[PDB]
Design a protein around this ligand. Structure first.
Ligand SMILES: [K+]
Ligand SMILES: [K+]
Ligand SMILES: [Mg+2]
Ligand SMILES: [Mg+2]
Ligand SMILES: [Mg+2]
Ligand SMILES: [Mg+2]
Ligand SMILES: [Mg+2]
Ligand SMILES: [Mg+2]
Ligand SMILES: [Mg+2]
Ligand SMILES: [Mg+2]
Ligand SMILES: [Mg+2]
Ligand SMILES: [Mg+2]
Ligand SMILES: [Mg+2]
Ligand SMILES: [Mg+2]
Ligand SMILES: [Mg+2]
Ligand SMILES: [Mg+2]
Ligand SMILES: [Mg+2]
Ligand SMILES: [Mg+2]
Ligand SMILES: [Mg+2]
Ligand SMILES: [Mg+2]
Ligand SMILES: [Mg+2]
Ligand SMILES: [Mg+2]
Ligand SMILES: [Mg+2]
Ligand SMILES: [Mg+2]
Ligand SMILES: [Mg+2]
Ligand SMILES: [Mg+2]
Ligand SMILES: [Mg+2]
Ligand SMILES: [Mg+2]
Ligand SMILES: [Mg+2]
Ligand SMILES: [Mg+2]
Ligand SMILES: [Mg+2]
Ligand SMILES: [Mg+2]
Ligand SMILES: [Zn+2]
Lengths: 149, 305, 59, 110, 154
RNA sequence: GUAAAUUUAACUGUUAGUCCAAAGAGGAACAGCUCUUUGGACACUAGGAAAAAACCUUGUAGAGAGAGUAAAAAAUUUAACA
RNA sequence: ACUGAACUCCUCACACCCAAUUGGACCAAUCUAUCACCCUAUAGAAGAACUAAUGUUAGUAUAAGUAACAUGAAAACAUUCU
RNA sequence: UCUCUUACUUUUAACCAGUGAAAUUGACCUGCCCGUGAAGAGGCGGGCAUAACACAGCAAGACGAGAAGACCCUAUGGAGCU
RNA sequence: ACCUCGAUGUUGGAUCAGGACAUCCCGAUGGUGCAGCCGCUAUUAAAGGUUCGUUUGUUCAACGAUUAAAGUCCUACGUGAUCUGAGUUCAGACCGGAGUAAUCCAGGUCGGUUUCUAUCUACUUUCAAAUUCCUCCCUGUACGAAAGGACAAGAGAAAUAAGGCCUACUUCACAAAGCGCCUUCCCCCGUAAAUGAUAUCAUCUCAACUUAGUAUACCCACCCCACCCAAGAACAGGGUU
């Protein structure tokens, strides 16, 4: 580690889900290869799975660029501007299908330590504690061992 | 951004004038304080038991033998009191102490070798700056107005006094000369160990106790003598003849006050209080004030019987 | 650092600046027992005597 | 005695870069009123002292050519003379040194 | 402890100290201006001041002749001392030599100084000069002096 | 009550042990002493005995800014008298 | 009464806290066969992985700018002096 | 030599300038007391102390450094000699 | 036989010591087969002190002369990167003994290399209260039959210890130094007694209470190039009128 890595407080993008839920995933870029065993799992994902996946999520733009490459990759871009690049080199159809769905659920914020598992903007409703909360008032507000007039 | 001194920019015609100009001002200020009882003196309380009066700041001239009527050769130290004045008074409440503190200076020095803060202090007091300033603990009935000069007549023969001054500094010295260790023999096989401390601690502790006698700087520290009596007082030159030797070299400033020893307590009944005032004295003191047992040089040769 | 925020005074005299910024006087932990001369006659007479001394006892 | 452990650079920087080890800036530097070069307030100007030595060396070379050997020191005063000059009224009975050069401005004839 | 020590420790010993100063003094008599390390110049300056005093005693004095014979390794300078240097400072009673500091030599960065006899025939050294009386600071003190003299005469 | 055991095949490795409780030897009804036996712990984690290989609590492995518990804090102030 | 564990429970996931030794599941880089063509796949092969052997070679720190080392004097650099 | 050391000179020394090593070094942001522990703690427990910081001394500690030291024992390890 | 067999030989001395009190001396106080001096013993007390020599490697011890006393110990049987290397310990040799010899020895004798440039910790003026003996006086007093012979208080002198100084003396000379000179200031709580209950006397009270012994001094400000300095390794410090 925690000391050796940065950290952030729990938060969302523009208070997602407060009035409506907005899918933070914005773009998917797949780079598969026509020839190459490294993309065997990725090619099967494109042939049967990405078509049905695009049906479920209309707000995410999916690009399938078929070019020669040794390591197929999936690039996910989010609304907040963070870009997450992942490699699907030699992965089964099920492993790719689960990984892509995980990217859809994330908001794009950095995957680092979160200081608190809770975040509230109005933690106090009856008044935040102050040292005079539980102290009774004295007549004329006189101080201890103080004489007036 | 470069420092400067008083006569850096002065021409050949101005340097003698500046030296003479400031010299005349010093003479005037010292000669304008010789009348303390006329320039609104503070009340003079009578002597009381348990009262402490202020001391002086003397300069060690040298040593001179002195013979008594008993025929014993006693050596005394000539302490010259020159340009001794009271600078300021601090009350017991402001002192944060049991006794009231009084400031005394001595040995008028140049005004060109002092800081601005010190110089402006003497500007309002109308006195030339003093080299060494000592603080004396006195009582409420011994207060003295600032600017009042002091003389060697403040003490009398037969009175025991305490002299404080810095000892002669011998620089860095080994244990043999600083603490008097025996050392090692020069012969019988000794190898590069003749004046070394040797063992400094035991092996079990694995450390050296604080305060262990080790080589270091010797001298140049304040040491106070006690139980030194005055055999002779000279009024013309303001010289105190203090028995024995006193800490410090020749021409060094010393702090002089009454003896703190219990055997010499409550002996100031016949001594001047708070101090002697030559301006208002009804009769001028003799040239020299001796002790009962002192055989003066003018007296004939002592003939024991 | 905590010892710097602790102020001790041998007597009841307190400097004005320290006295002018006090807030609450914490109660004393131990309740001071009353001396025999501080009891009023109402409480002394309320407490019953347990024994009757003989009239011929010098005491 | 040999070191028990190796002293780190962090310890060394505190020792090597201590203000005591560092060079102290000097405040006694001023410009020479004659030539304008730098000099210290308590030290003669290097440029001015150099031109005196160059002229002094030339004068002493002339003296050697007149004595013509060691152990021939004269018992009279010496006078340095330049082009366009003649011995003065007070420079009588002395050893004159002729210089084939104009008298320097800083050299004041007395 | 070195209290009251006025003489420095130079050379290979007390005897070598005299010989080193004797060579500097002899070279000072012949050339009337030499440059040397500051400490050796300052130590030799005392002998140069008192050497003229023996020269004022006259060349007929046996004691003065021996001091000249000893302190002057070159025998040709002895006639010069009693016939040039001594007559030169007949009116003066002391301070025959002036000592000034010069830039340190490049060989060992040693503190150097130049010592010369006053009134020599050599070009004047660039002696340090105090600020002129026409400066702003001097004129203010000059004006103060005039009023003080005028006030005293009143 | 439970789920191991034996045989077959293939070889490696460990055996200069400690301390505690208990029974008994040698020493001196000494030793952090030596030598057997039974059992535990230790060389496997954690909590508690102040720090703690051997005492007590407790094991099968992760995350939690939840909860219930285990062992777990020394006591003691003493002389009248026929 | 409370405090109190990696014991237990709770939400979730579970192959994921022993020496020697033994059984495995994977795997870096390299070469070859065939692919692959911003550096990969399946196989074969092997000089196949170094926080440690007062290891070997090379670089550079530490002790350390420390120990230690050196030029007789003046000067016209002719010369003279010690 | 010592009771009983002292003074002085020279070298060394320290400072300025030039040149510039060696043993040593797990990492150190490198305290005292008491206790504890593989039985002798700068690092563990409990107390106390504590702005940073160079230079010069000192030699109690770092079971200080330097040659697997000497000293006893071991090896079905050597050699000399009788 | 637990730690140390990948650089502590051990003993003793020199140097400087810190600590314990189970106290050798100085201090206070009970008992005594304590008249007084001397003694013995017990409680309290570790502030201070605890010698110089002959043979011996010595520790120790013997006796020599003293002292108020010449304490018992611990500390890596203190201290050896401070020193010594005499005894023991490696190579030589001899005497005596053992062994056929090589060679050996709890013995005697002679000789025999003791390294280190301080990296780290610690420390480098505890700003300053001193102890003791002798002589004298009390006093030839109390005591005792005499012989003998004291308290306490005061004085003087001397010594050491601590801290200074150079007018003399001395080593010496703008100075340093001692062999020389000067100064040195608190109680100590072991007990001895009153009043007085528990326990109407008495009883000094881990009953309430009373009585005897139950601190001061030193240090304190804020131009500087350079020179000088009784200041100083450097730095710093003082003076420069
Ligand atoms: K050491
Ligand atoms: K070692
Ligand atoms: Mg000095
Ligand atoms: Mg000696
Ligand atoms: Mg040697
Ligand atoms: Mg020697
Ligand atoms: Mg030299
Ligand atoms: Mg857990
Ligand atoms: Mg569990
Ligand atoms: Mg599990
Ligand atoms: Mg492969
Ligand atoms: Mg390999
Ligand atoms: Mg490597
Ligand atoms: Mg290696
Ligand atoms: Mg060093
Ligand atoms: Mg050197
Ligand atoms: Mg040479
Ligand atoms: Mg250097
Ligand atoms: Mg090296
Ligand atoms: Mg630190
Ligand atoms: Mg310990
Ligand atoms: Mg600790
Ligand atoms: Mg150091
Ligand atoms: Mg050393
Ligand atoms: Mg065997
Ligand atoms: Mg006792
Ligand atoms: Mg020992
Ligand atoms: Mg030893
Ligand atoms: Mg040692
Ligand atoms: Mg020997
Ligand atoms: Mg021998
Ligand atoms: Mg002394
Ligand atoms: Zn110039």
């Amino acid at each position: 580690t925690a000391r050796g890595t940065p950290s952030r407080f729990l938060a969302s993008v523009l208070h997602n889900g407060l009035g409506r839920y907005v899918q933070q995933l914005q773009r998917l870029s797949f780079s598969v290869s026509r020839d190459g065993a490294s993309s065997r799992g990725a090619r099967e994902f494109v042939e049967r799975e990405v078509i049905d996946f695009a049906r479920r999520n209309p707000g995410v733009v999916i690009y399938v660029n078929s070019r020669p490459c040794c390591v197929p990759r999936v690039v996910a871009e989010y609304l907040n501007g963070a870009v997450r690049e992942e490699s699907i080199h030699c992965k089964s159809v099920e492993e790719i299908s689960t990984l892509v769905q995980k990217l859809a659920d994330q908001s794009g914020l950095d995957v680092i330590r979160i200081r608190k598992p809770f975040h509230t903007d109005n933690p106090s409703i009856q008044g935040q504690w102050h040292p005079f909360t539980n102290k009774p008032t004295t007549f004329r507000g006189l101080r201890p061992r103080e004489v007036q007039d | 951004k470069s420092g400067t001194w008083w006569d850096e920019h002065l021409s050949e015609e101005n340097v003698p004038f500046i030296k003479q100009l400031v010299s005349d001002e010093d003479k005037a200020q010292l000669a304008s304080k010789l009348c303390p009882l006329k320039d609104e003196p503070w009340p003079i309380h009578p002597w009381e038991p348990g009262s402490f009066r202020v001391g002086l700041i003397a300069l060690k001239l040298g040593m001179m033998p002195l013979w008594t009527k008993d025929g014993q050769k006693h050596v005394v130290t000539l302490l010259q009191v020159q340009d001794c004045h009271v600078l300021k008074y601090t009350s017991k409440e402001n002192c944060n102490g049991k006794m009231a503190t009084l400031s005394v200076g001595g040995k008028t020095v140049s005004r060109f070798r002092k800081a601005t803060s010190i110089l402006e202090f003497y500007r309002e007091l109308g006195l030339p700056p003093k080299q060494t300033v000592k603080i004396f603990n006195i009582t409420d009935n011994a207060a003295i107005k600032p600017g009042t000069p002091l003389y060697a007549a403040h003490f009398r023969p037969g009175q025991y006094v305490d002299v404080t001054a810095k000892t002669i500094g011998k620089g860095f010295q080994g244990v043999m000369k600083r603490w008097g260790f025996k050392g090692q023999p020069a012969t019988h096989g000794q190898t590069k160990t003749h004046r070394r401390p040797g063992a400094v601690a035991t092996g079990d502790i694995g450390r050296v106790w604080p305060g262990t006698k080790m080589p270091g700087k010797m001298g140049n520290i304040y040491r106070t003598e006690y139980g030194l009596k005055v055999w002779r007082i000279n009024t013309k030159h303001n010289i105190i003849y203090v028995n024995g030797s006193v800490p410090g070299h020749k021409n060094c400033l010393v702090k002089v006050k009454d003896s703190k020893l219990p055997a010499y307590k409550d002996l100031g009944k016949n001594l001047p209080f708070p101090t002697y005032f030559p301006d208002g004295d009804e009769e001028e003191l003799p040239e020299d004030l001796y002790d009962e047992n002192v055989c003066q040089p003018g007296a004939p040769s002592i003939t024991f019987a | 650092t905590m010892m710097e925020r602790l102020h001790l005074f041998p007597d009841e005299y307190i400097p004005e600046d320290i006295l002018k910024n006090l807030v609450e006087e914490l109660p004393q932990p131990r309740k001071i027992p009353k001396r025999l001369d501080e009891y009023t006659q109402e409480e002394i007479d309320a407490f019953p005597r347990l024994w009757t001394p003989p009239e011929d006892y010098r005491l | 005695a040999a070191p028990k452990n190796r002293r780190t650079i962090e310890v060394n920087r505190c020792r090597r870069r201590n203000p005591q080890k560092l060079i102290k800036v000097k405040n006694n530097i001023d410009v020479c009123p004659e030539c304008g070069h730098l000099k210290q307030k308590h030290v003669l100007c290097a440029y001015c002292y150099e031109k005196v030595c160059k002229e002094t060396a030339e004068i002493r070379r002339q003296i050697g050519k007149q004595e013509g050997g060691p152990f021939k020191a004269p018992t009279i005063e010496t006078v340095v003379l330049y082009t366009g000059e003649t011995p003065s009224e007070q420079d009588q009975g002395k050893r004159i040194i002729e210089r084939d050069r104009k008298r320097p401005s800083w050299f004041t004839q007395n | 402890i070195s209290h009251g020590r006025v003489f420095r420790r130079m050379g290979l010993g007390p005897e070598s100290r005299i010989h080193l100063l004797r060579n500097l003094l002899t070279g000072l008599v012949r050339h009337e201006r030499i440059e040397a390390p500051w400490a050796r110049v300052d130590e030799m300056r005392g002998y140069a001041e008192k050497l003229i005093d023996y020269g004022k005693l006259g060349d007929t004095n046996e004691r003065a002749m021996r001091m000249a014979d000893f302190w002057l390794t070159e025998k040709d300078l002895i006639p010069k001392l009693f016939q040039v240097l001594a007559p030169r400072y007949k009116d003066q009673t002391g301070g025959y030599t002036r000592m000034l500091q010069i830039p340190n030599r490049s060989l060992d960065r040693a503190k150097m100084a130049v010592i010369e006899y006053k009134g020599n025939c050599l070009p004047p050294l660039p002696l340090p000069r105090r600020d002129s009386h026409l400066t702003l600071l001097n004129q203010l003190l000059q004006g103060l002096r005039q009023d003080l003299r005028q006030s005293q005469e009143a």
